[PDB]
């Protein structure tokens, strides 16, 4: 079985691999961002949005990955191995769902094709400041 | 942040720890069950149910756990370690979402309190055949 | 003062001594049926039913008895055997009756305790071998 | 599962810790206060106030562990003068709270636990000698 | 800029100087009077009475200078038994005034500070031994 | 008891720890923005806004700390360094947040603290060099 996690939300894995690899903030910055303004919404008993159902499983599954790393740390390249390949897939899943909740789903998707083509023009022919999605 | 994965669906972790530990079928039996009759629904681009959004993330996160186990198998108690503690949490998440999709959400929740009290009566004072939820 | 514990719920102890001593599940499996099915109503800041108020006092009465069991073990064996088995049967049938009045409803349990009475009093030569099962409808 | 026995009645166990441990009358004085006032109502088969359900259970729980004090006495002390002192103190707080909530009303006892809070908190040079008594 | 912390609540700091400096209960007795009564209301994200805003700030200002007493203790006394005695007295007047204005109402505390004025002013031969207590 | 200082105003400390330590002006320039713009409302005998009640307690909490700084200097250096710089950053972001909720309005600040969050978390290679400025409309 092959299923993209972003497929119902209107994006792809390729369109999330369209941004650079080190554009996404770290997991500590992203988890504190969700814990900043989405604690009373994520820990609600009733689900509000399909982003909320996907984000409850993104945090819990990364919790299972971290306690697997501390267990294998006791019994440290393997704790560094998870942040290379398994760590990119959780940052992209966290950044996409946090930003779609704050700003909007279609606003993130239009930003992904805007920052993707901004990073792939020559510097002397593009707007100099990098595009950042923001409120107002 | 502390969030149960079953909290929006009307259950708890305790009510899923109400059944015995080895009641749940293995991950191979459960993944082939979802691949049996939910391939054209889970791999749809549009999300149908909150069980579908939770089940797309249950399969993908267990995929990240298995390739972590083959990587640490190369670089085998650790491949057996994941099936003791990290393996119960994925079987319960797979069994709850497969059975709620087939039969119904409230039918699984009424079955959980039915099989829970069936296993906790003396044998001579209970119905002899174990309760199994089934169609018709 | 000789109070009947569940006289106000439509039963007696004499109606509920008909069940055998091995009819009730153990206190661990009885507290788990209370904790797993409905702890949100037991920890609630209001009293939903008179079974709930009787169930909050019944759990904490057993918890005080379990404090006495570890105290006589650590500080200061037959008395641990006494709380678990002799005074525990009064907690088990108190926990069973209040859980079952909330799961299946109260009138279902009281009609079951009569229909167990016609089964447990007949000699074994003239009764069906399976005991009557408790279930709604 | 840690239940507060008074939480349904509007008082926490922390709010009832305003009263000192040696404030409460003896269990013999509390049971005769019950037997003189509420003997028909406690032994009736009729449903009553939720203090009545908690008062039938608190007397019988004391009665169950009264026979434990009788049984441990002959069959061999330090235990019999522990079971009514330390473990019977939780009966005294439970018997005092339900006798007084039936007689003087519930909300007056909630106003009494606060008004005993301001009495026991004040320094000895500025507190009245009249300890607050509960009267009607 | 010299602000009165009580001026918005109808009392001046001169009017609250009727009460003696050793009248006020200790800060440990005031915080448990808050924690037993108002723990849900203080920690709620909902706007409440203007005593609640001043009570969240008075606890956290005491909490900030509580860590100052911890930090000055090891890192080197006279300072740690000055910061809770002299500088913590302004907390005790601020914690007493807002606990009592929430429980007994605001105008009763304004009527209590005046009625404690006539008690402490009278000569010792003509004053009642009952210091005025605040009850409901 | 673990109280959040501005939970009731629509924020957290975790939402407001995203700003750097050098984002806030010093306590002298923060008290002057309170004293010069509106001291008539801070010295007023009524509470206009819940930011005003939180601002009266925040100024006098710092004034008590400045009394401790001169007392440890005159009577009885690293502890003067501690109040000014380590516990002063908790006063600076408390003074900044309540002043800005009264100047620009509260919803403007909370939408600014999110939009600073998307700026401060991105790496410097992919963010514009100027930080987002706070202003109404």
Numbering used by the authors:
A (entry chain C), B (entry chain C): 111 to 185, 198 to 258
C (entry chain A), F (entry chain A): 111 to 186, 198 to 258
D (entry chain B), E (entry chain B): 111 to 186, 198 to 257
Q: How do the authors describe this structure?
A:
Here we describe an alternative form, termed N-VelcroVax, a VLP vaccine platform assembled from a monomeric HBc protein (N-anti-SUMO Affimer HBc 190) with the Affimer inserted at the N-terminus. The dimeric assembly results in the formation of 4 helix bundles (spikes) which project from the particle surface and a sequence at the tips of the spikes comprises the major immunodominant region (MIR). The VLPs effectively bound SUMO-tagged Junín virus glycoprotein, gp1 as assessed by structural and serological analyses.
N-VelcroVax VLP samples were vitrified for cryo-EM data collection. This confirmed two different sizes of icosahedral particles. Reconstructions of each particle stack with icosahedral symmetry imposed revealed that these corresponded to T = 3 and T = 4 configurations, as expected. Interestingly, both reconstructions (resolved to ∼3.5 Å and ∼ 3.3 Å, respectively) showed continuous densities located between the four-helix bundles on the surface of the VLPs. Unstructured internal density was also observed, possibly representing non-specific binding of nucleic acid derived from the E. coli expression system. Initial inspection of density maps revealed no additional density attributable to bound SUMO-gp1, although there appeared to be a subtle change in the orientations of the Affimers, with these being closer together in the N-VelcroVax:SUMO-gp1 complex map compared to the unliganded N-VelcroVax map. However, for N-VelcroVax, in which Affimers are attached at the N-terminus and spatially constrained between the four-helix bundles, Affimer density was resolved. This suggests that the Affimers in the N-VelcroVax system are more rigidly constrained in their position compared to when presented at the MIR region.
